[PDB]
Design an enzyme around this catalytic site. Structure first.
Site, PDB file in Angstrom:
ATOM      1  N   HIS A 206       0.696   5.714   9.890  1.00 57.57           N
ATOM      2  CA  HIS A 206      -0.045   4.562   9.401  1.00 57.57           C
ATOM      3  C   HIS A 206      -1.117   4.123  10.390  1.00 57.57           C
ATOM      4  O   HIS A 206      -0.864   4.021  11.596  1.00 57.57           O
ATOM      5  CB  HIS A 206       0.901   3.390   9.132  1.00 57.57           C
ATOM      6  CG  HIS A 206       0.327   2.365   8.211  1.00 57.57           C
ATOM      7  ND1 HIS A 206      -0.616   1.445   8.619  1.00 57.57           N
ATOM      8  CD2 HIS A 206       0.537   2.132   6.893  1.00 57.57           C
ATOM      9  CE1 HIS A 206      -0.948   0.677   7.596  1.00 57.57           C
ATOM     10  NE2 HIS A 206      -0.266   1.076   6.536  1.00 57.57           N
TER      11      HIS A 206
ATOM     12  N   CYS B 275       0.829  -1.200   0.000  1.00 63.81           N
ATOM     13  CA  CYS B 275       0.000   0.000   0.000  1.00 63.81           C
ATOM     14  C   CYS B 275       0.865   1.253   0.000  1.00 63.81           C
ATOM     15  O   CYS B 275       0.609   2.201  -0.751  1.00 63.81           O
ATOM     16  CB  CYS B 275      -0.936  -0.013   1.213  1.00 63.81           C
ATOM     17  SG  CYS B 275      -0.109  -0.257   2.814  1.00 63.81           S
TER      18      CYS B 275
END
Ligand SMILES: NC(=O)c1ccc[n+]([C@@H]2O[C@H](COP(=O)([O-])OP(=O)(O)OC[C@H]3O[C@@H](n4cnc5c(N)ncnc54)[C@H](O)[C@@H]3O)[C@@H](O)[C@H]2O)c1
Ligand SMILES: NC(=O)c1ccc[n+]([C@@H]2O[C@H](COP(=O)([O-])OP(=O)(O)OC[C@H]3O[C@@H](n4cnc5c(N)ncnc54)[C@H](O)[C@@H]3O)[C@@H](O)[C@H]2O)c1
Ligand SMILES: *C[C@]1(O)CC[C@H](C(C)C)[C@H]2C=C(C(=O)O)COC(=O)[C@@H]21
Ligand SMILES: *C[C@]1(O)CC[C@H](C(C)C)[C@H]2C=C(C(=O)O)COC(=O)[C@@H]21
Ligand SMILES: [Zn+2]
Ligand SMILES: [Zn+2]
Ligand SMILES: [Zn+2]
Ligand SMILES: [Zn+2]
Ligand SMILES: [Zn+2]
Lengths: 336, 336, 334, 328
Positions: free
Chosen positions: D176, D149
């Protein structure tokens, strides 16, 4: 003759570690051996020393000569998945705290006897081991019982309060909700929990209903309440500290001020250190690292009438329970 | 919007924005004016368009020629601090949603009639305005009532469930806990809340007990339950969706399966869209943006016996209530 | 012989400056003003703290005063700081910790009620700013109104000092990942001057501006114009981290950087700049009194001139202790 | 058309969800041996982060039926004998978190057909990032990776910045959201001690190869980027913070123009662009790989800038796995 019992811990987790902390803080028992195949010695130093919830250990902890040394005391470290293979006897461990969560029947917990342990204290409810709650029925322990359970965090919260309410007013029936902090069995995001689908859902995002036998279990430690209590839980995203919400019908009329009076009296006398009592405007974080099993929140509860009331009691599910495990072992040692 | 009553919204806080969202999502009423002296037109676009909890508005929103334009419909924007000076009549607003939270008495909410509004709906409990819960007592509304209240989200969750239980089995007495998502009245870190000290403690860190009259207020919309219900709340750090936990004693015996049957029946008939029913393994996030007032969780509740049960019902405290405000106005419009 | 101190604003910093004063004993709190917290409420807010636990000591209301560890404190309830009778209360220094009187003109209102010096517990558009360990020896007795800068500047500047002293900072860009604060909202709410800051703080990572890195060029003049940066607010209740990406004038291996930071932390910056190689996370710094703790394992170097350096700070406790430290050092210069 | 999915975790389900939501491909098989067919219906239907599936999902004498399409499940523990061939699985997506190497992931044509896509960085499989190096895939490669990602967020942005001004060097931080490998309370994570600490309570530093991996899909940037991460207690949506030195001078407004231009043209739907006052939840279920936040970034001067880009670490990647299989 038994003096200060030597203890082995199986499962160096939240409860395994905080039982060890509590043993060194109270000095009531001596930790001499720890087994955890998923935490090696150097890692145990780190996990014991730093704690997100209760802060850094006040004391010294290091690895030396293959031992975990806490406040200068060396502890033998085992790395066995099979509890029947842990050499507790060689390490001098007399009582074993079974705090893995996966050996909670007498048959499974009895594995520790094969390695030379004398008794086992299951840090959780047991399908068949006799259960004890300090302050409620621990004086029913006797030395013929080699494998016992210290019940659940929630039963240790509800049962001391239930005993005072029942003793004074008589509980006809009661229904309990516990709003409970997240624990290691939950998930950070939606994941697999095939037995309990709700418990797989993300713990940080969700209020999660869950079953618990804690209220029914109070009928085992208070036999007069057998069949008279049950309940359920909601899991919520706080890291620690939980609360019991007991809705009960009373046999004798009780003004809320009379309920407060007898609970405060019990907290100052026969249940001192077990049952607490406050009238302050408290929230859950005010009980972080609080060693009581149960702290009655006078201002939070509410009566509909003289016979139907909602009673609120707080518990640090990690810290209160861990201290009770140590307290129970010291009491068992006194009865050898 | 053919033949729909024209509505003005006082206040573009979260309730006013969500009422506006529900009006355009359902088509049931026509928002033609919004008053807010503290939020300019460009900020209104931003606040309506982006929503952390329920996502971006499914539609169009823009500022154009001094009006807010939602899905192509222009909305007159007022900025009056004195509600008696808002020119509702000139904008065509017939009913006004009083959503600021500081004009909840009849004396204060009635100010909107001076500027030519014809009826006022207070989107909060009122000390004196008659209160209504759709599906429970909304048929007691009549054209003489110029200023009314839609009660609270929690009352709107409990009352439909209490109606069904009382109608079928008789509620002798009940005590309610709501485990409540965080609200705008709470604080991010420990701060001042001089009237309600626990509510000042950091909302992310704490389970926070709180008083609530929501259960007692069910005695207003269901007069037979006056004096028979009260309760309290725990605020917990989730962003949306709350749950009602009703512990009640029943007059007639009721197997849990019978409770489920009649709740499900109501959910599919006269309380359709108001009272929901599920047996699925749900958690709080599964009701995000759910427009029911109340969704009974069959699997989460528990009975001690035929006369004493704990019933669980979910509500998106934001979306359900706002849609009821719209539904209530649609019902009022049907009478004239 | 300790200086007597008044606190304006009994908030996170007002209360923790008071806690730090009584814990360290370095100054004597004799007066507190907060028109939004009455005496009985002050007892409660000071006693119980969600973040740092219950106060270790005694606190009660007695004879209309707040009594901490047996020391009575005069309580004022004035909205207008020019009306606070600091001099009558014996308060020589005033900690200005409300957040709304940060210019010299506004903070100087306290001189009218008899305070001798004011320490603004926040950045100031015009008051001289000081960071303990970096430029606090530049304070002099002519300065009646000063600023202790921000929590973030107190984290960045001691680290920036060591790096610039040893290798030189050509230029740097800073991100701070910052815990939520009292200015934020629990759910999407009004913040008309800073729209992102009105969004719900529990649900969101929120980008925000901060002058903290630029302000280091004021306490370290050679770095004027060579640093700036920004912030992400994230949903933790306390403890923040600075992430400094900088280009060095002279080449340094990452082990050289560790050596000079460790040496600084053990010597001249002891108690201000910390140093660790442990596998730490933010919770490990809760109630840690350092201004800045370098996380050796967390940073990374691309080459000998381009490095990313990580330093932790308890934005409440480090800063509050620095406020007390600064006043202690001011008093030693009277 | 025609795809099978090994594993039914966050990535497996959201690839499955992106498949039916976009119609770019047809899901025809699922494995994940630790969840029965009934449980599969529940996990796909309800999602704490992205809401209930916009469609229908049932079980009808075996076969997971999504919007009227049978799927067939296999529940097999090791991939070597899953029988993808008789199912119609023209492609297979790995998703399990293990089997990221070309040898371990290879056990899918042993009972299957054609090509295999790894939903994670690979030690030795060729990695691809849509919009960056995907037009360099060829039919010889039958075990490929879609990177991570984070690489999918950084690489499109790095490409535009590098193509226009040249990146001399850059250091990246990812802030994150929490992931499934984290722990609810302090627990064991023996190889990565910080990652065992309670995810709700902590900002947690973490290592990531995502910025180094960009030099693999953009070879001109090899050795010129590295970075790290902070895990924070939000449920979804992450952000990239790229601090870089540029060869050619760039006003921030010129950086904005070329990124906005790329977002409307060749990188449409991959790289997004906004000047709105956004926060992380504004990107929940956003399908872009990377959305440049114009107002959030900051420049010290014409050669030294900090660039900010958001990504739904679940939804954007999942739709890229689908878009990659579309382009084959
Ligand atoms: N956390 C609480 O509040 C709490 C309170 C009271 C009781 N309990 C009970 O105590 C028990 C432990 O709970 P916890 O929260 O500490 O869980 P935890 O997951 O934090 O700790 C369990 C530990 O056991 C270890 N372990 C796993 N398998 C093992 C094996 N075969 N041999 C040895 N060690 C092994 C794990 O590595 C882990 O460290 C559970 O039964 C729980 O129900 C928990
Ligand atoms: N919280 C931190 O981490 C931190 C760290 C360093 C510096 N600061 C700075 O310190 C200042 C205080 O921040 P805080 O976090 O303590 O905020 P806070 O909101 O917790 O405290 C502010 C207090 O000031 C009081 N107050 C408001 N108006 C007043 C007035 N007119 N007179 C007297 N008192 C008044 C309020 O009742 C409140 O208790 C801010 O400028 C902040 O930027 C904060
Ligand atoms: C204390 C705990 O580990 C966590 C909560 C759990 C319920 C209330 C959700 C407790 C009850 C147990 C039970 O009822 O069997 C398990 O043992 C416990 O101690 C847990
Ligand atoms: C410490 C704090 O109160 C909170 C965070 C804030 C930024 C980093 C988001 C700090 C920075 C300030 C600045 O230098 O502009 C403001 O004052 C502060 O102390 C805050
Ligand atoms: Zn401590
Ligand atoms: Zn206590
Ligand atoms: Zn519904
Ligand atoms: Zn009409
Ligand atoms: Zn320190």
């Amino acid at each position: 003759f038994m003096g200060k019992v030597k203890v082995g811990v199986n499962g160096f987790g939240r409860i395994g570690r905080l039982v060890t902390r509590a043993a060194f803080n109270s000095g009531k028992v001596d930790i001499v051996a720890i087994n955890d195949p998923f935490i090696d010695l150097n890692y145990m130093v780190y996990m014991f020393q730093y704690d997100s919830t209760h802060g850094k250990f006040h004391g010294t902890v290091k690895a030396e000569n293959g031992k975990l040394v806490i406040n200068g005391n060396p502890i033998t470290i085992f790395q066995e998945r099979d509890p029947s293979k842990i050499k507790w006897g060689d390490a001098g461990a007399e009582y074993v705290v079974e705090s893995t969560g996966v050996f909670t029947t007498m048959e499974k917990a009895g594995a520790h006897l094969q390695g030379g342990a004398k008794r086992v204290i299951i840090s959780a409810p047991s399908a068949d081991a006799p259960m004890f709650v300090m302050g409620v029925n621990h004086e029913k322990y006797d030395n013929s019982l080699k494998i016992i359970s210290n019940a659940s965090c929630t039963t240790n919260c509800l049962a001391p309060l239930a005993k005072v309410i029942h003793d004074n007013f008589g509980i006809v029936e009661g229904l309990m909700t516990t709003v409970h902090a997240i624990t290691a069995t939950q998930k950070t995001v939606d994941g697999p929990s095939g037995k309990l689908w709700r418990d797989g859902r993300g713990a940080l995002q969700n209020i999660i209903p869950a079953s618990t036998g804690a209220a029914k279990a109070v009928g085992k430690v208070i036999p007069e309440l057998n069949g008279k209590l049950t309940g359920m839980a909601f899991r919520v995203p706080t890291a620690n500290v939980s609360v019991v919400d007991l809705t009960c019908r009373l046999e004798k009329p009780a003004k809320y001020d009379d309920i407060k009076k007898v609970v405060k009296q019990a907290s100052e006398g026969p249940l001192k250190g077990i049952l607490g009592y406050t009238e302050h405007q408290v929230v859950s974080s005010d009980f972080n690292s609080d060693t009581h099993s149960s702290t009655f929140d006078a201002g939070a509860g509410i009566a509909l009438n003289d016979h139907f009331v909602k009673l609120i009691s707080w518990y640090d599910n990690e810290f209160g329970y861990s201290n009770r495990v140590v307290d129970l072992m010291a009491h068992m040692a006194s009865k050898e």
